[PDB]
Amino acid sequence: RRWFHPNITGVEAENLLLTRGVDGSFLARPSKSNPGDFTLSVRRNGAVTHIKIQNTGDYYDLYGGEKFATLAELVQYYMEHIELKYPLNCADPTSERWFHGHLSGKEAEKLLTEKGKHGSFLVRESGDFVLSVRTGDSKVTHVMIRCQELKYDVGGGERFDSLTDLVEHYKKNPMVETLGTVLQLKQPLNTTRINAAEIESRVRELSKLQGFWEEFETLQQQECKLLYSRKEGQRQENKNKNRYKNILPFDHTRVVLHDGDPNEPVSDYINANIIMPEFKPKKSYIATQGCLQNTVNDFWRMVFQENSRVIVMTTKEVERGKSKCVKYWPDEYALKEYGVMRVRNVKESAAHDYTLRELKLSKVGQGNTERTVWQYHFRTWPDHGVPSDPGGVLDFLEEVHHKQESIMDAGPVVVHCSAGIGRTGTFIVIDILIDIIREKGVDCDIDVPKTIQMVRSQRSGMVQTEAQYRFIYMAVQHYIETL
């Protein structure tokens, strides 16, 4: 993911591609004119083309292109299918997990002493730099990094173009001390894990000139490790089963549909993934896209087979004149058959922020297969961005949690929006985090980007924007404050 430059301007991007690039050279950057948006800058026939990428929280929408779950997936697609030939690599270490910009020597040592373990390392500014590594069962070693004529070195040997290149080299080739100590750079220092009681202090330091952005962009740089196979969703027979062509379930976590019509060559596919905390069917989730008219039967087959008793719908059926999800439930008191599944809508209960629908699901032909499915439909989420206060979402997640908990042997909770990655990802992450505080008390350890990285290894692009990332912190804070 080196083609992503987090701090360059449109002008710097232009001069970078014209002087250091060639025809086919490209890079991507956060937009300066529109904060929260992105630009893909491509060099074609001696000139630079700037392509807008918009993300309001549901997906990356390339102007004159397609819709994608991540920026790395967008790039992989155009590099394997305006030509994107050569990534123009970024040397700026700001989004590295190990880089701590302006951190003092005293602060670095206490961080490695209180939070470190064998192989824990960080890099701080001294225009020189310091590499600090902890070794043992223990001691901290400091390695000076000289910057001489735009190149970096540890006072001998190779001279690197960037700090990333130097760190990568000494990770594969560890430095050995005179008396035999191997300075192993096993993992970056974990500085994101906080005690749940200390959330207000972290939210305060992240809100200062913001820190939320640096933490979120360091998380985004790591998405290139999550380019897992999505082959089943690419099969010809499964193409019209996807709301967005390029937003596909990972094959290793996808919901596999069994007992399908024997006359149907392919009846095992749904654009849905199992999401397991720390990767029990109960405390599990199914993140899925909003139903298409041709996937409504597959959706009820999925709900039935998984023994799900609770559905969370986080979108209105229609938003900004566009279909986000088709009505997959009957009108109040009506009974509908969706293929071999039968659904009765028993009652509809309206609250301020959401609607609750009591649905009775069963298989046609078998009376004793009947179970109540509780559908919680959040209706107040803004068309763009996140709510200004997390109170509404928290009361909703509390209700959903109590329903799931009261049901013996309940299957995973089904969570869906439009693409089933943005709002869906945000609801699932908040709910994982809150469940840790429920089970272990306010005196517990939480790590927001670790939790998101784990959920993202099970479905592409879970939690889409920095606004959602910030919302997760604000929701966890509010839960703890009212505790």
Ligand X SMILES: C[C@@H]1OCC2(CCN(c3nc4n[nH]c(-c5ccnc(NC6CC6)c5Cl)c4c(=O)n3C)CC2)[C@@H]1N
Q: Per the annotation, where are the binding residues?
A: 383, 417-423, 464
Q: Quick check: is 224 catalytic?
A: no
Write out the DSSP string of 158-185: --BSSHHHHHHHHHHS-EE-TTS-EE--
Strand partners, 54: 61
Work out which of 21, 188, 411, 420 binds ligand X, going by CB under 6 A.
188
CB of 158 to ligand X, least distance (A): 24
- Could you tell me the strand order of the sheet in which 60-62 lies? 67-68, 60-62, 47-54, 38-44, 25-30, 86-87
What is the phi-psi region of residue 29: left when phi exceeds 0, alpha when psi lies from -120 to 50, beta otherwise? beta
CB of 445 to ligand X, least distance (A): 12
CB of 131 to ligand X, least distance (A): 14
CB 245 within 8 A of CB 292: no
Comparison of 101 and 105: residue with beta carbon closer to ligand X: 101
CB of 206 to ligand X, least distance (A): 9
CB of 452 to ligand X, least distance (A): 8
Segment interacting with ligand X, rule: CB under 6 A, options 13-21, 265-273, 376-384, 448-456: 448-456
Comparison of 39 and 218: residue with beta carbon closer to ligand X: 218
End-to-end CA distance of the chain: 41
CB of 107 to ligand X, least distance (A): 12
Comparison of 61 and 447: residue with beta carbon closer to ligand X: 447
Applying CB under 6 A, does 219 fall inside the site for ligand X? yes
Segment interacting with ligand X, rule: CB under 6 A, options 18-26, 65-73, 90-98, 267-275: 90-98
Strand partners, 373: 359
Could you tell me how far CA 209 lies from the centroid of its own chain? 24
Helices and strands in the chain: count of H runs, count of E runs = 11, 26
Give the length of the chain: 483
Q: How far is CA 310 from CA 169, 403, 405, 422, 423, in A?
A: 50, 8, 10, 19, 17
Comparison of 167 and 394: residue with beta carbon closer to ligand X: 167
Q: Which of 90, 291, 325, 417 is catalytic?
A: 417
Which of 52, 42, 46 is closest to 83 using CA atoms? 42
Six-digit token string for 325: 């999800």
Measure the CA–CA gap between 251 and 382, rounded to whole angstroms. Answer: 32
Comparison of 192 and 355: residue with beta carbon closer to ligand X: 192
**How many residues sit close enough to ligand X to count as binding (CB under 6 A)?**
19
Which residue ranges make up the annotated binding site for substrate?
Answer: 383, 417-423, 464
Write out the DSSP string of 194-232: EEGGGHHHHHHHHH---HHHHHHHHHHHGGGGG-----G
Q: Using CB under 6 A, which residues numbered 92 to 151 contact ligand X?
A: 94-97, 99-101
Buried b (16+ CB within 10 A) or exposed e, 8-23: beeeebbebbeeebee
Could you tell me how far CA 282 lies from the centroid of its own chain? 22
The mark string for 189-218 relative to ligand X (x by CB under 6 A, - otherwise) is --xx---------------------xx--x
Q: Using CB under 6 A, which residues numbered 222 to 241 contact ligand X?
A: 222
Say which amino acid occupies 331.
D
In this structure, what DSSP letter does residue 2 have?
A: T
Comparison of 344 and 450: residue with beta carbon closer to ligand X: 450
Comparison of 116 and 390: residue with beta carbon closer to ligand X: 116
Q: Which residues touch 86 (CB under 8 Å, ≥6 apart)?
A: 21, 22, 24, 25, 26
CB of 218 to ligand X, least distance (A): 4
- Chain contacts with ligand X (rule: CB under 6 A): 94-97, 99-101, 188, 191-192, 214-215, 218-219, 222, 447, 449-450, 453
Catalytic center residues: 417
